[PDB]
């Protein structure tokens, strides 16, 4: 599990986190709740605006959808009624690819969720549950399934997959699925098998994470 993270590493920003998995370095930033614009408010719930900068090039359409699916996942994570007529701008930076951006977007989508989850903990906003995302691929030639592949394995991968889950009761109960990003060729039969490791693995991920949060923040906490 060659993952590792940092909390509270920016200065003027409410929530900040560096998430580092095996090859990709991504930092996310959270500022909120702050003053919303005119065209942006909601009378009841909390308004969210999300920016992802790539490592390379500028913000285009390829960025836009990875943003927007990430809009969908955070919306139930946030206790959105708690902050009416408000705004939390959240911003993600891709620093390292770790995957061919021309051909793939898979790991980053797993990465940025795992990034933005922790900067909210830095931010300390009313949230709902716990979460995790992993990238999963199925090899074209071997026809086997690897959790957390590499980009060369992505080249021989047949189908690329991202699973986002909602974890409660010690992060143990799968409360709901958040995202299942099925891409590539697949059938019925692989899919329930495709969950069935990530059923375990994301909890196994969070099992690491629960420790990490308290280790970083209980010395920031006072006794």
């Amino acid at each position: 599990m060659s993952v590792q993270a940092e909390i509270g590493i920016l200065d003027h920003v409410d929530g900040s986190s560096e998430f580092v998995s095996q090859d990709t370095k991504v930092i996310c930033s959270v500022t909120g709740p702050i003053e919303p614009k005119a065209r942006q408010e909601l009378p009841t719930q909390l308004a969210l605006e999300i920016i992802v900068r790539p490592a390379k090039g500028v913000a285009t359409t390829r960025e836009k959808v990875l943003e927007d699916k990430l809009r969908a996942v955070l919306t139930p994570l946030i206790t959105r009624h708690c902050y009416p007529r408000q705004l939390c701008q959240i911003t993600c930076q891709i620093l390292e690819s770790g995957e061919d951006e021309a051909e793939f977007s898979l790991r980053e989508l797993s990465c940025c969720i795992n990034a933005a989850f922790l900067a909210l903990v830095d931010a300390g906003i009313a949230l709902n549950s716990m979460c995790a995302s992993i990238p999963i691929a199925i090899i074209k030639d071997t026809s086997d399934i690897i959790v957390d592949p590499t980009a060369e394995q992505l080249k021989i991968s047949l189908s690329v997959h991202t699973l986002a889950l909602e974890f409660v009761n010690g992060g143990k109960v799968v409360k709901n699925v958040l995202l299942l990003d099925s891409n590539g060729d697949f059938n019925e039969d692989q899919l329930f098998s495709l969950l069935e490791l990530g059923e375990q693995k994301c909890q196994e991920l969070v099992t690491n994470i629960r420790r990490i949060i308290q280790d970083n923040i209980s010395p920031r906490l006072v006794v």
């Binding site: 500028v58 913000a59 285009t60 359409t61």
Partner: protein, 215 residues
């Protein structure tokens, strides 16, 4: 280039090719867009030339600007698929559009209220082996039907008729003119340019009122 769209790799290019009194006709339809409150559909086909276009209504929309006594019209001409008329070529027509309806619409019935008009020059055949001037009068007809569909207070079924690069718009069964447009043509052909426009106007308005009163 444009960082907001997918325009392909730059060094590509589109594909290239080289050489190796008549009747106009309509098919007019309303009530088919659920975003709008006024829709109108127009087919046209005449002798080498087949044309289809869509007129869209949004109103009365609120005005964030300030107070007005009455209503305000906004008109958009947009290229469809094949034919590409020039940008500045478009808005000149949009200017010519608004003048006529400002002798049509009871804006005084609609204080502080907006009028949105979207015209989609969707598809045109010109198979013939002032190219925008041949499509002027059909716009006014296409707008009028959609504006009847939103049910807005209109004085007259006003229409324009065409005679060979010349566009003249009428009311009162042709007994007054509300909109004048002229390109090159002859000199002092105006009196015949009264006539052939008028009778198409005499044709068209009857085709329009059939499209609604029979529905």
């Amino acid at each position: 280039q444009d960082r907001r769209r997918l325009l392909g790799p730059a060094a590509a290019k589109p594909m290239a090719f080289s050489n190796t009194e008549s009747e106009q006709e309509l098919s007019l339809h309303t009530g088919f867009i659920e975003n709008c409150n006024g829709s109108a559909l127009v087919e046209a086909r005449s002798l080498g030339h087949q044309t289809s276009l869509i007129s869209a209504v949004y109103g009365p929309r609120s005005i964030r600007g300030s107070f007005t006594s009455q209503g305000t019209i906004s008109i958009q001409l947009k290229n469809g698929l094949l034919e590409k008329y020039n940008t500045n070529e478009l808005k000149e027509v949009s200017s010519f559009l608004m003048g006529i309806f400002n002798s049509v619409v009871n804006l005084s019935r609609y204080p502080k209220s907006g009028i949105d008009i979207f015209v989609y020059l969707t598809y045109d055949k010109d198979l013939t082996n002032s190219q925008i001037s041949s499509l002027i009068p059909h716009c006014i007809t296409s707008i009028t039907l959609a504006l009847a569909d939103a049910g807005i207070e209109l004085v007259d079924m006003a229409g324009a008729g065409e005679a060979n690069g010349t566009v003249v718009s009428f009311i009162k069964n042709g007994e007054e003119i509300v909109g004048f447009w002229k390109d090159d043509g002859d000199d002092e052909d105006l009196l015949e340019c009264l006539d052939r426009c008028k009778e198409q106007y005499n044709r068209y308005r009857d085709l329009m009122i059939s499209c609604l009163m029979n529905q």
